[PDB]
Amino acid sequence: AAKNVVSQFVSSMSASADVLAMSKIEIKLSDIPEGKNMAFKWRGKPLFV
Amino acid sequence: SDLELHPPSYPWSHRGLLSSLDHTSIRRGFQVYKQVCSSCHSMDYVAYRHLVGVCYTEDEAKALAEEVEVQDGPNEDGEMFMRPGKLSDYFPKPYPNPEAARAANNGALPPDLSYIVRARHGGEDYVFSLLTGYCEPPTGVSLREGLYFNPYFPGQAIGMAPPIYNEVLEFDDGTPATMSQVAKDVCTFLRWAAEPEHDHRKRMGLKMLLMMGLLLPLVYAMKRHKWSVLKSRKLAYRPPK
Amino acid sequence: HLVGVCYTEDEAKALAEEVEVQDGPNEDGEMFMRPGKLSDYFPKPYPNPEAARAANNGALPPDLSYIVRARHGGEDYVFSLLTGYCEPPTGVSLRE
Amino acid sequence: GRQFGHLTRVRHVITYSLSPFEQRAFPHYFSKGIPNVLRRTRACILRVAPPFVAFYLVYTWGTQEFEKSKRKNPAAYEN
Amino acid sequence: GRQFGHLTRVRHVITYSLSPFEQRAFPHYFSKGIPNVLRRTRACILRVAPPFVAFYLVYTWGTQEFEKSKRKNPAAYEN
Amino acid sequence: TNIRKSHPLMKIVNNAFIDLPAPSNISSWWNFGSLLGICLILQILTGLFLAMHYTSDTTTAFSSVTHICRDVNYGWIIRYMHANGASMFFICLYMHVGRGLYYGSYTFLETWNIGVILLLTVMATAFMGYVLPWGQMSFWGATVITNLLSAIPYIGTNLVEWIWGGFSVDKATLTRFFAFHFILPFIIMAIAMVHLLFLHETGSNNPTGISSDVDKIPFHPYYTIKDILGALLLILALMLLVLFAPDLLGDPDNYTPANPLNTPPHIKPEWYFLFAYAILRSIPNKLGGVLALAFSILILALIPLLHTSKQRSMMFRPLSQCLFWALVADLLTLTWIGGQPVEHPYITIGQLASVLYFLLILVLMPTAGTIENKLLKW
Amino acid sequence: TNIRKSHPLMKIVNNAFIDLPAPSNISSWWNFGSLLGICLILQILTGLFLAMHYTSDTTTAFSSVTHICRDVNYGWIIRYMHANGASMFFICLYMHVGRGLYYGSYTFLETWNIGVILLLTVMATAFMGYVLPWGQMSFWGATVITNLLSAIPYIGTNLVEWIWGGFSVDKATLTRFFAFHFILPFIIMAIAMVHLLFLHETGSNNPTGISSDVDKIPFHPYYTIKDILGALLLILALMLLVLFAPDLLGDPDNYTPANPLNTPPHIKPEWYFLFAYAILRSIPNKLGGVLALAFSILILALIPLLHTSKQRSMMFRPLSQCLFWALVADLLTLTWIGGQPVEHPYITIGQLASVLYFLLILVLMPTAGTIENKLLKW
Amino acid sequence: APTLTARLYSLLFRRTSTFALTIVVGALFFERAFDQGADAIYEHINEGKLWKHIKHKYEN
Amino acid sequence: ANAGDFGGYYCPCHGSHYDASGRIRKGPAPLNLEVPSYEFTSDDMVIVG
């Protein structure tokens, strides 16, 4: 019983079943000219193309 | 109007102590929600993903999510277009402003459905009875426009049209969409839309009883042991002379 | 906020009335427009933040309430940045 | 605070006791148990029970009259 | 915890003292004050001050070289 | 030498539940002190885990709780243990005070008094507690109550708006209450220790009110294990609710968000204030109603001044034993009435129960005491 | 009989600051214990008033603080006293630990150790504190730091995401931190009392490290008033900031909300972590950097094991007296470097200062001690 | 041939080491077997699961 | 983007220098920046995830 209640309490901070979103993004290459670093938002984190 | 009546005890498949919900019946219920209620009843808290473990499956959830078009995040020009349907977002549907619910249904608020089974006394049965209840006004009486009649209702003067028997379907494999079959299913789903944890709760509850069933006696036999020294202690008083 | 500071009662009302903000929805779920109160702030230029980028070419003119405490030097950096404006010497470039 | 050794004065009393590992934790659990709780219940029914049935009587009659006050209300209104 | 009366043992020492309402709170505040803080400062400059000027020297030289490393950078690039 | 006795820290722990001499004599009615302790920590403990997910802001208040119940891994058990533990904390608080009167424990003035301070604070806490989810009961519960201070002559108005942060309950009121609902249980926890400090000065009273110095047993084995079993029982109950009947003691309408426009003809504070509720409105007065509501609880601090009997416990006092139960049942009455609408039978009977309450504690029990003295020839 | 001595409560108060015998001898370096106390309560006190207006929720976080500063009657002084009191709480914490080493106070193991526990906790608290307004520094401050646990072999990743509530800093992270920033100062406050409990076991050390039993004075008059004056001085300083230079010690860019897209090439934790910051990055290692950062503070708990001198205070120890100041200045160095970008001079010098720090405390001071012994013929 | 409880005491309960070792070793196997039998009991009395519902949707 | 000794990237928090390939060359960073799962669906489009 100590295991379980403690585990359940541990898991309630872990990652809310809702905060799990974000998958595939599509970027047009002709919009990024030679020599430039373009940043987008992907999975809540910066993605550089 | 001042007098009232309360619901009976429909023997739900989840009324018993350790009783799970009928997942097949939660399914048909969502259907009843989507085709019928969804065009008047907001359900701000449930989502397509919430349905994933419960009734439907992975791909199925995606598909049902795609059958609408929600206003996604703004884009570069500050747009806010439309998109197929994810899994992520919920069922925010019928009206924007709350008063726009009043502008449609004459001055009446069809309240959120996530609520329901736990926001009304009697729970499922009150909604079951309120739906399959629908009867006809006897003498005395009145009504304004179509402030329909319902006994299982505070005052008896609702503003909700009885969208029950309009036999809509898609009960895959084969299920007669009769009034009563349709009402049990909505409720059964509405139970789950209010208390999703419902089945786990009782699964644990079983273990809780089963655990305490070993522990209570044991942690009690332990206390006996230690107190037994005191319980069988013998006194003698031996004064001088 | 301007009432005690610079302007006066009636004056504040008047300056507030010289715009038209989107007030609360009404019975039909409207959201009309109205003169100007005193109550609300100065939420102005653009709705979406990227709409600031669509106008001024890819640049965010940041909130002004910030400013004097969000930039090192405070007033002087903004004073200098405004009255500073000079011309590019050799080397150099510029896009548009 | 008060410790053993400084509590109070005791004259001539012997106390025999026995190891827990040498006796039963539930001597005559039911044999002597039930009779005793009957005895303690009996010993106290009369001071505990009465006020509760009084509440009990007032509770059932109270709701009764509450329904029969309105529902029963009509009643007669004849003309 | 430890109370007066149970602290330690003291032999033969007399202590004369005077009521605060009978003396000055600032006897010779400046007359005797300044000379003493000079005396305590003197007594300690050499152990406190040195590490701080060392930091002081390293701080000014450190920023110096930081600007003269980049700004000064060009410098020469002649062709 | 035994470090368990000379180490500044252990001392305290040795004195608390190891070497402390206790009556070989106490019975189950003495468990509610551990249970209240347990309650206090478990409440503090689930309460905290809810705070890592809760919000405040009237817009998100309700939304966050549902977020927890549905989205937060296991958020539901936590939320429901918190809400159900809150009720249990009252059942015990109630039982504790009960044990107290019956057995004459109140003769330890300081201890009893700290306990009254402990009562008002957990009441004040639990009140703020239910305003948080921002439900219907939360809004008018938070309104019907708070207002009462508006009955205070000359300044009532000022205070009620000062506690409000506006002219009604909104923005300023939810954040306020959350913060207070957060800091109070810590303060309570301190007060508890002082309560317990003063208790150790005399040791515990017992079922006979006699004096057990002649027969004390070590807290070691005995009351530690009899506290463990006990706590297991408290867990059974708390879990029975949470896992089988989560909303049995909860008003179903604190679901459905707030609405300063509505007010659902019914509305009563959580069960544990019903007896008090009944008292207040069983008086046709703004000032009198609230004045009477206060006396309803602040009278505990009066009890010791009306001890009249030559014996301490009621163990050997049939007359008072009867008036004790009449008090309990009568409180069960007030609870029931409090739960009903202000209509026909219900009014006059709840009006009688109120008078009874005050007449019983203020005249009947004190007299029962004197007659018993006279009967015994004391 | 004097109730001030036999009443269970007063005893404690008599023992705390009335009858407690103290050295006739202590000087200003002993005031920071009251100041830390004062700091702790004032922090708890303004902190609470901010909580009746603050929020959490990433959307409203920043907005609420400004709301307070502009809209809330007097919210500005409260907000700024809180933020400035936080710095003062470090100045004192710093001075306290300083006083401690110099004078050898650390010989009271339990007391010293509780004090280290007191250090980490207020550090852990103040860290969470600045994440709250949800500014730029708040976001990456909350990011650059927390991450460090990702350097822990095999499980680093798991923990950093567990403390996060997601895969980055957001929703789950602000509410969490607020709640922890709320419960910690209470827990600290408890620990403080235990700190103080163990301190009363020996009484106070003094400028000579000798032993004042031969000349103790009552806390009554003496140290109560010398604590009052002292506290007034602490008020002067705290008010000087708040009322004349509110943002002098505050990073101007915690203004302007968050933005997981940005990161403004500069970013350093609040001043009081600079020395630590410098240490960590003055090491080309993820594991080593954080390992070294830990040792940077956890070394205090090592100091007593390297007391080598036959005298307790450094009052009569020129050699060590020199290495003490070299330590302080060197910490002032680390603070300065920490405040600079990881570029040319700044790198190598902050790299030297780090080595110095550890070599000074671990080799230099312990040797200075032994040589002094030898010089005295001890 | 002594007793089960006797032999049990000698080899595992006597020393607080083995005593504790026994319970951590005994808790692991208990959590597993109690969770099996329990859930099984929970299912057997039910059957409107999402377990027996899957057979229908292996496709998409 | 475009800062540091290697004309690629510079992380200002503790001084990590990366090249135009995203590889670590100076500073405390233990590994190269992560290359996400990606493919080109055409000459103008790239889909990440």
Ligand code: HEM
């Ligand atoms: C099976 C689908 C539906 C269900 C289960 C459902 C159930 C409910 C329930 C339980 C209430 C509140 C009862 C109470 O206050 O005690 C309600 C209110 C209402 N709903 Fe529905 N309804 C459904 C479909 C509709 C439809 C199609 C309409 C459009 C006519 C509608 C318009 C209303 C209105 C106007 C009210 C207001 C009644 C009142 O408060 O006066 N709902 N509904």
Ligand code: HEM
């Ligand atoms: C924060 C809530 C409270 C806690 C945590 C608490 C804790 C305790 C504990 C641990 C005991 C000793 C064990 C026992 O006798 O059961 C006790 C006894 C007592 N408490 Fe409380 N109690 C609380 C509320 C009260 C209340 C409401 C009262 C009465 C207003 C009260 C007055 C007493 C008295 C008089 C005793 C002595 C009991 C006896 O000797 O038989 N305390 N309490």
Ligand code: HEM
């Ligand atoms: C300091 C530890 C505590 C914290 C951090 C805490 C925090 C919270 C929070 C955030 C909520 C709203 C979430 C929810 O409603 O489930 C809440 C609800 C509540 N808690 Fe606490 N609280 C604490 C101690 C207490 C105490 C001492 C009591 C009194 C037994 C208490 C009784 C309540 C009540 C009555 C509610 C609202 C009832 C309900 O959930 O429906 N909690 N608490």
Ligand code: HEM
């Ligand atoms: C919560 C923060 C702290 C508080 C509230 C606190 C409070 C106090 C107080 C009131 C005193 C007695 C007065 C004085 O000597 O100044 C004291 C002395 C002491 N503290 Fe702390 N302190 C705290 C942090 C520390 C730290 C950081 C340390 C060292 C890690 C520490 C170890 C000591 C020691 C060893 C003493 C004895 C001083 C002496 O005898 O000369 N405590 N503290």
Ligand code: HEM
């Ligand atoms: C339990 C009493 C405390 C409460 C209720 C409290 C609550 C808060 C709240 C709501 C904020 C955000 C509002 C603002 O930033 O001005 C805040 C900021 C902060 N407080 Fe606390 N806190 C408390 C004790 C502390 C302690 C012990 C410290 C450590 C000295 C502390 C240092 C901070 C810091 C550093 C900040 C953010 C810095 C800033 O304002 O820019 N507070 N606190």
Ligand SMILES: CCCCCC[C@H]1C(=O)O[C@H](C)[C@H](NC(=O)c2cccc(NC=O)c2O)C(=O)O[C@@H](C)[C@@H]1OC(=O)C(C)C
């Ligand atoms: C953290 C747990 C360690 C325990 C120390 C604190 C807890 C504490 O002090 O422990 C002892 C156990 C204290 N007394 C009793 O329990 C007790 C006393 C007489 C009889 C019985 N039982 C049956 O006859 C008892 O159970 C008691 O139960 O008080 C709690 C309220 C307090 O709890 C508190 O303070 C809170 C403020 C923490």
Ligand SMILES: CCCCCC[C@H]1C(=O)O[C@H](C)[C@H](NC(=O)c2cccc(NC=O)c2O)C(=O)O[C@@H](C)[C@@H]1OC(=O)C(C)C
């Ligand atoms: C509420 C105010 C009443 C005071 C009781 C609590 C406070 C308390 O215990 O008071 C005494 C005053 C305690 N010691 C000293 O001050 C002190 C001791 C030796 C010398 C000096 N000064 C100059 O030589 C001192 O000032 C001290 O200062 O500790 C504080 C941290 C503690 O504060 C705390 O615990 C907090 C946990 C409350």
